[PDB]
Amino acid sequence: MEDENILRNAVNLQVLKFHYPEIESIIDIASHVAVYQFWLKTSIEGTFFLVKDQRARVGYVILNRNSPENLYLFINHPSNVHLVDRYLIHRTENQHVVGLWMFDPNDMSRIFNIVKESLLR
């Protein structure tokens, strides 16, 4: 019964590449995620796509529902991502932190696993 899943992945990936041509594949998806900063809510909210790019860099795109402004960020090291309270916390080098709020708390641990397994060597 995998046809509809193959097609959905193909439509999703075609749209992603339309915005970001270097995107190579979708690793997984979380239906509804909001982005936070300090913790203050940003304008960015929508579907979260964990993606691999041309150079094998792991990252994610949120296709924003609030405006055409999307978010695309890389996860450079699996250690960059922690579960703290209700946020999936994503840290870049010198204390640059983004907080991901997953509607559905199941996706926190789920996406955390996927990110670590994507960056596993």
Place this chain on the structure above:
Amino acid sequence: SFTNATFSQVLDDLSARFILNLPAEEQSSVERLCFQIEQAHWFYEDFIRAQNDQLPSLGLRVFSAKLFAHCPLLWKWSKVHEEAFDDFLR
């Protein structure tokens, strides 16, 4: 990006951004699907048309008709029958 994008590429975007990837809990629901189509319609009229002036301004019924004709699997992915959707919006 939406500049120079075809009507077809716009409908693809809107499907993936609003319709295709609903959580299991929001599937099998006519009113939720309608809400998402409505949200997609606003995004289209408000953001997409401001970027590409050649795109047609559409009412809700005609917009929905074009999103669903563009991809009949939208019914399958949201787990809603077209019959039920039509009876809801009459």
